[PDB]
mmCIF file of all heavy atoms in Angstrom:
data_model
loop_
_atom_site.group_PDB
_atom_site.id
_atom_site.type_symbol
_atom_site.label_atom_id
_atom_site.label_comp_id
_atom_site.label_asym_id
_atom_site.label_seq_id
_atom_site.Cartn_x
_atom_site.Cartn_y
_atom_site.Cartn_z
ATOM 1 N N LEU A 217 0.249 -2.365 -5.738
ATOM 2 C CA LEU A 217 1.627 -2.345 -6.174
ATOM 3 C C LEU A 217 2.454 -1.778 -5.024
ATOM 4 O O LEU A 217 2.160 -0.671 -4.561
ATOM 5 C CB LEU A 217 1.774 -1.503 -7.446
ATOM 6 C CG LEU A 217 3.175 -1.253 -8.026
ATOM 7 C CD1 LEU A 217 3.745 -2.569 -8.562
ATOM 8 C CD2 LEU A 217 3.148 -0.161 -9.119
ATOM 9 N N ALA A 218 3.454 -2.540 -4.568
ATOM 10 C CA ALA A 218 4.261 -2.119 -3.388
ATOM 11 C C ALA A 218 5.724 -2.106 -3.732
ATOM 12 O O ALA A 218 6.273 -3.108 -4.240
ATOM 13 C CB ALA A 218 3.968 -3.057 -2.183
ATOM 14 N N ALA A 219 6.402 -1.007 -3.400
ATOM 15 C CA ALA A 219 7.856 -0.884 -3.519
ATOM 16 C C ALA A 219 8.477 -1.159 -2.143
ATOM 17 O O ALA A 219 7.979 -0.644 -1.111
ATOM 18 C CB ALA A 219 8.209 0.548 -3.940
ATOM 19 N N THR A 220 9.526 -1.964 -2.144
ATOM 20 C CA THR A 220 10.327 -2.211 -0.926
ATOM 21 C C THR A 220 11.802 -1.860 -1.135
ATOM 22 O O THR A 220 12.294 -1.841 -2.268
ATOM 23 C CB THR A 220 10.188 -3.678 -0.435
ATOM 24 O OG1 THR A 220 10.294 -4.585 -1.560
ATOM 25 C CG2 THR A 220 8.815 -3.904 0.233
ATOM 26 N N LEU A 221 12.492 -1.520 -0.042
ATOM 27 C CA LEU A 221 13.876 -0.988 -0.159
ATOM 28 C C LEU A 221 14.959 -2.071 -0.350
ATOM 29 O O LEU A 221 16.118 -1.894 0.050
ATOM 30 C CB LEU A 221 14.207 -0.020 0.972
ATOM 31 C CG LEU A 221 13.339 1.249 1.011
ATOM 32 C CD1 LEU A 221 13.862 2.235 2.038
ATOM 33 C CD2 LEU A 221 13.223 1.910 -0.389
ATOM 34 N N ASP A 222 14.543 -3.189 -0.958
ATOM 35 C CA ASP A 222 15.437 -4.235 -1.446
ATOM 36 C C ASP A 222 15.397 -4.217 -3.008
ATOM 37 O O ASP A 222 15.508 -5.263 -3.660
ATOM 38 C CB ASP A 222 15.034 -5.602 -0.891
ATOM 39 C CG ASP A 222 13.559 -5.966 -1.170
ATOM 40 O OD1 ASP A 222 12.840 -5.162 -1.794
ATOM 41 O OD2 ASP A 222 13.169 -7.090 -0.820
ATOM 42 N N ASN A 223 15.230 -3.020 -3.571
ATOM 43 C CA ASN A 223 15.251 -2.846 -5.033
ATOM 44 C C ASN A 223 14.152 -3.678 -5.748
ATOM 45 O O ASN A 223 14.393 -4.238 -6.795
ATOM 46 C CB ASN A 223 16.625 -3.192 -5.602
ATOM 47 C CG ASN A 223 17.752 -2.582 -4.795
ATOM 48 O OD1 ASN A 223 18.532 -3.285 -4.121
ATOM 49 N ND2 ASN A 223 17.848 -1.267 -4.859
ATOM 50 N N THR A 224 12.991 -3.730 -5.147
ATOM 51 C CA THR A 224 11.927 -4.596 -5.646
ATOM 52 C C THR A 224 10.568 -3.938 -5.616
ATOM 53 O O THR A 224 10.217 -3.227 -4.683
ATOM 54 C CB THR A 224 11.881 -5.939 -4.837
ATOM 55 O OG1 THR A 224 13.174 -6.591 -4.941
ATOM 56 C CG2 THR A 224 10.814 -6.873 -5.429
ATOM 57 N N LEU A 225 9.805 -4.114 -6.703
ATOM 58 C CA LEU A 225 8.388 -3.817 -6.748
ATOM 59 C C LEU A 225 7.598 -5.121 -6.832
ATOM 60 O O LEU A 225 8.050 -6.056 -7.502
ATOM 61 C CB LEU A 225 8.084 -2.964 -7.994
ATOM 62 C CG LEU A 225 8.441 -1.473 -7.898
ATOM 63 C CD1 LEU A 225 8.556 -0.949 -9.335
ATOM 64 C CD2 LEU A 225 7.342 -0.735 -7.157
ATOM 65 N N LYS A 226 6.443 -5.144 -6.159
ATOM 66 C CA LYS A 226 5.620 -6.358 -6.151
ATOM 67 C C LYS A 226 4.183 -6.023 -6.382
ATOM 68 O O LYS A 226 3.654 -5.026 -5.864
ATOM 69 C CB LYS A 226 5.788 -7.096 -4.811
ATOM 70 C CG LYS A 226 7.150 -7.753 -4.653
ATOM 71 C CD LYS A 226 7.167 -8.535 -3.329
ATOM 72 C CE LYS A 226 8.486 -9.293 -3.169
ATOM 73 N NZ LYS A 226 8.609 -10.353 -4.211
ATOM 74 N N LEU A 227 3.526 -6.865 -7.197
ATOM 75 C CA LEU A 227 2.113 -6.744 -7.436
ATOM 76 C C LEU A 227 1.404 -7.805 -6.594
ATOM 77 O O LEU A 227 1.654 -9.020 -6.802
ATOM 78 C CB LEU A 227 1.802 -6.961 -8.919
ATOM 79 C CG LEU A 227 0.354 -6.716 -9.342
ATOM 80 C CD1 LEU A 227 -0.038 -5.260 -9.194
ATOM 81 C CD2 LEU A 227 0.135 -7.208 -10.783
ATOM 82 N N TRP A 228 0.577 -7.373 -5.646
ATOM 83 C CA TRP A 228 -0.148 -8.248 -4.713
ATOM 84 C C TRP A 228 -1.634 -8.356 -4.993
ATOM 85 O O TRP A 228 -2.272 -7.353 -5.218
ATOM 86 C CB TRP A 228 0.013 -7.746 -3.280
ATOM 87 C CG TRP A 228 1.388 -7.825 -2.714
ATOM 88 C CD1 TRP A 228 2.416 -6.948 -2.886
ATOM 89 C CD2 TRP A 228 1.881 -8.912 -1.911
ATOM 90 N NE1 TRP A 228 3.540 -7.410 -2.230
ATOM 91 C CE2 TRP A 228 3.225 -8.603 -1.603
ATOM 92 C CE3 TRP A 228 1.326 -10.075 -1.401
ATOM 93 C CZ2 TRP A 228 4.043 -9.442 -0.820
ATOM 94 C CZ3 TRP A 228 2.126 -10.919 -0.621
ATOM 95 C CH2 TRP A 228 3.463 -10.591 -0.335
ATOM 96 N N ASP A 229 -2.177 -9.569 -4.962
ATOM 97 C CA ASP A 229 -3.596 -9.747 -4.734
ATOM 98 C C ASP A 229 -3.776 -9.589 -3.232
ATOM 99 O O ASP A 229 -3.475 -10.529 -2.480
ATOM 100 C CB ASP A 229 -4.070 -11.147 -5.215
ATOM 101 C CG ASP A 229 -5.559 -11.348 -5.094
ATOM 102 O OD1 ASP A 229 -6.179 -10.891 -4.089
ATOM 103 O OD2 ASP A 229 -6.159 -11.977 -6.006
ATOM 104 N N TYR A 230 -4.224 -8.438 -2.796
ATOM 105 C CA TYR A 230 -4.228 -8.118 -1.371
ATOM 106 C C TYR A 230 -5.199 -8.990 -0.575
ATOM 107 O O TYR A 230 -4.911 -9.378 0.550
ATOM 108 C CB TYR A 230 -4.441 -6.591 -1.091
ATOM 109 C CG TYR A 230 -5.830 -6.134 -1.416
ATOM 110 C CD1 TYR A 230 -6.876 -6.281 -0.502
ATOM 111 C CD2 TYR A 230 -6.132 -5.553 -2.666
ATOM 112 C CE1 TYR A 230 -8.145 -5.882 -0.805
ATOM 113 C CE2 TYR A 230 -7.411 -5.135 -2.955
ATOM 114 C CZ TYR A 230 -8.412 -5.299 -2.059
ATOM 115 O OH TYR A 230 -9.715 -4.895 -2.333
#
Side-chain angles (χ1 to χ4, degrees):
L217 176 68
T220 45
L221 297 187
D222 56 359
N223 315 110
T224 302
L225 282 160
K226 289 184 177 293
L227 186 66
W228 292 84
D229 184 320
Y230 69 83

